Design a protein around this ligand. Structure first.
Ligand code: HEM
Ligand code: HEM
Ligand SMILES: C[C@]12CCCC(=O)C1=Nc1c(nc(N)[nH]c1=O)N2
Ligand SMILES: C[C@]12CCCC(=O)C1=Nc1c(nc(N)[nH]c1=O)N2
Ligand SMILES: NC(=[NH2+])NCCC[C@H](N)C(=O)O
Ligand SMILES: NC(=[NH2+])NCCC[C@H](N)C(=O)O
Ligand SMILES: [Zn+2]
Lengths: 405, 405
């Protein structure tokens, strides 16, 4: 057979070979002796040049111009600029291309059928933390679009030789606060405890509800961060209710429309963009299963099961399962009622299968992280569970990065 | 270097140091992770010696006897045997230890808390298919123990130089037939279509039902397989009813009490046991999710959802998730009403956590395959979902092997 990964789908009985992985420059955490695929985070000179050269080639390739004069001219111009300034800049449409690509390359994202439709806001002119606030507000305005959501990314200035990074401290543009108590517990979203304490430490006046939208903490080159509160009318939220369980409404649960990861470094041709928030729309299970049922988040399963009158003294009643289905249902219903874009884990995964097939044709593979693509309820009930997948790092990429503090 | 392994629910980190013991390579390389592939792409005297020395040192260590008189004379035995015949033989108590350690090392198995309680039948004195059938019959009889299930393995003669393997052609000792219909579709378990055909092709007259217990095809070295029908009364079956929905029963669904895998190979101290069928008891989801709801299995979701009165027409109604849940519920009710051992997915993954904990203290880790340990439903609702796991091959070991035909 071909010596590239044989990938099988056990439901359809079909084979593909992933030849795309051959392009991976970067290595991940597995070795022949032990597989580390399940861990969340696995433990410049002439280097820049070859990262840069490869990205330009991806670009010129994508516009079908490999070998052309614009192409070799562009390669020369890049290495003249690394030659003298130790770095280089990207043309506008080179940035747009690379941003989209990073998304298309992201092994953990199930929504990639949408990769070619992303609005890229150049913000490489940004000079202050004030300015960052304006762009972010603008992004949120555009992306939200009164509930009819549009995928977008804003790109702030890249990293530079001996000059401090641009950083958004928050992990998402929109996050609920988590307050620590002496009684040990956490009010709000326990994931956000640290960023909450940090905002207070930098001079925020805390609320004290389960659902207080956090202020942004925005950092500009070689400065302490600055505090910024989102105008509430910009932050669209969805109150949660059940289509038939009248009391669910009374739990006073809510969620925000816009998922906007603000802490991930965007790497393109070796240039590093530390502040480059992107947003899409949610998949039902992110809110409904992880955010609301993780034992270390809102952990509402028990509350709800009691309301449903389930027997929670025993695992074999599948009370945890019954409550979960009904919560997910409520998330979906409430967004549909509110006319805010959402996608259920079935439709979502069905579209990823379509994505897998498009990429097979186009690139000869699609890097994908199974543990992360399979939804956290109803896994085997969805087609991706039966689909083997190869994971590998391609560049451009979205990458995790150490916290500014 | 040893992997930091984090639990995300509890914030606890640990370090897996056992994996340094692993001698066999897996399918992953630093360039791409093949963690989710089911089977290997792949699938001497000096080397067997070393696998055997390593195993014997293991066995004496296990009984607190390293460097004892017994230990050294046993190594010298093996020495002499191999040096002469190109091979050697295990003592019964070594086998017993080996079988146990093989289950202990099995990364895809969530029942390993049970690893020390295994009844081991030595069947290495078997010269025909007939005898195999009598051994297979005692195993079932004992394992089943009228519903109070008990874990067993039955080890037939090891492979040898230049003669056929003892093999059980069936993938489990109890499986339902799959009959192809002229119109392409399959009546009964579609994963068993091949094994069904082979049985008709060696003289078995088929049933015409969804739930026909297949015969056994048993092969002694270099003979045509022979066919044997299991006695109806040795094969315990549960009919499927549901606690509250009366029509469910009418649906006629049944399943069998004994999960007895028969197509895998047991490797101990480099000896290979080509027929070593083992059984424990079922986890509910194996049946109620996979075997009944996989689209390429009995595929019953839509039938139920229809009976359940649900909006079949759109994915947003979560009809699948809803039906899946009842179906698992009914498997659990039905087994418990028949006083036949079953473990649910919540209880099982809770006990798998304890196991991981016991093995941390005992060995410095636990080879575990995340994608196989997380149930097919309610993933993030069990504690394993949140537990990083390192996967790798330790010996003794169950391995897959080619089909004999
Ligand atoms: C358009 C609608 C979209 C849907 C339904 C979608 C779906 C998802 C889901 C379910 C995850 C895993 C989330 C988790 O469990 O934490 C994910 C992760 C990711 N997505 Fe997408 N996505 C979409 C748009 C986008 C866009 C526009 C980008 C970037 C341009 C993106 C890039 C990523 C990245 C980088 C991750 C991994 C983040 C991490 O490792 O924590 N997503 N997305
Ligand atoms: C005590 C009752 C047991 C329970 C509840 C249990 C649970 C499981 C489950 C859910 C799987 C995944 C199975 C699948 O989806 O096909 C599994 C796999 C496995 N189990 Fe256990 N198990 C038990 C006993 C045992 C015993 C006694 C052995 C060997 C002596 C064993 C060896 C394995 C092996 C080799 C696999 C790999 C399956 C494969 O590759 O097909 N299990 N077990
Ligand atoms: C289950 C696992 C990987 C193992 C550890 C963990 O907590 C995870 N977390 C996430 C995951 N997948 C997604 N989409 N999101 C997670 O947070 N997969
Ligand atoms: C989903 C995956 C791994 C990927 C390929 C596949 O079809 C699987 N099959 C099984 C699995 N886990 C279990 N327990 N059993 C499977 O058959 N995990
Ligand atoms: N659909 C997305 N873009 N998700 C991005 C990750 C958001 C994060 N999982 C959340 O629930 O807020
Ligand atoms: N509980 C076990 N040890 N099972 C072995 C696998 C059985 C297989 N999953 C089945 O449904 O028949
Ligand atoms: Zn791996």
């Amino acid at each position: 057979g071909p010596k590239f990964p044989r990938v099988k789908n056990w439901e359809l009985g079909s084979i593909t070979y992933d030849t795309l992985c051959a392009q991976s420059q970067q290595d991940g955490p597995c070795t022949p002796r032990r597989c580390l695929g399940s861990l969340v985070l696995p433990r410049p000179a002439e280097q820049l040049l070859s990262q840069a050269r490869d990205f330009i080639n991806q670009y010129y390739s994508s516009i079908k111009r490999s070998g052309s004069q614009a192409h070799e001219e562009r390669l020369q111009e890049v290495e003249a600029e690394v030659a003298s300034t130790g770095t280089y800049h990207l043309r506008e449409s080179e940035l747009v291309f690379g941003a989209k690509q990073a998304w298309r390359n992201a092994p953990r994202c199930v929504g990639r059928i949408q990769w070619g439709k992303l609005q890229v806001f150049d913000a490489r002119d940004c000079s202050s933390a004030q300015e960052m606030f304006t762009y972010i507000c603008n992004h949120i305005k555009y992306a939200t679009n009164r509930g009819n959501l549009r995928s977008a990314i804003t790109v702030f200035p890249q990293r530079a030789p001996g000059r401090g990074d641009f950083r958004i401290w928050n992990s998402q543009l929109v996050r609920y606060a988590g307050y620590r108590q002496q009684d040990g517990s956490v009010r709000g979203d326990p994931a956000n405890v640290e960023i909450t304490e940090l905002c207070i430490q930098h001079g925020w006046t805390p609320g004290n509800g389960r659902f207080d939208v956090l202020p942004l903490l925005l950092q500009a080159p070689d400065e302490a961060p600055e505090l910024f509160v989102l105008p509430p009318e910009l932050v669209l939220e969805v109150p949660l209710e059940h289509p038939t369980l009248e009391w669910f409404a009374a739990l006073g649960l809510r969620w925000y429309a816009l998922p906007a990861v603000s802490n991930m470094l965007l790497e393109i041709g070796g240039l590093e963009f530390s502040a480059a928030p992107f947003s899409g729309w949610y998949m039902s299970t992110e809110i409904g299963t992880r955010n609301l049922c993780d034992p270390h988040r809102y952990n509402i399963l028990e509350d709800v099961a009691v309301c449903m009158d389930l027997d929670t003294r025993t695992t074999s009643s599948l009370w945890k399962d019954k409550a979960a289905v009904e919560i997910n249902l409520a998330v979906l219903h409430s967004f549909q009622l509110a006319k805010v874009t959402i996608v259920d884990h079935h439709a979502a995964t069905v579209s990823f299968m379509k994505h897998l097939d498009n990429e097979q044709k186009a690139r000869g593979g699609c890097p994908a992280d199974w543990a992360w693509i399979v939804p956290p309820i109803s896994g085997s009930l969805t087609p991706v569970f039966h689909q083997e997948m190869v994971n590998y790092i391609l560049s451009p990429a979205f990458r995790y990065q150490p916290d500014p503090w």
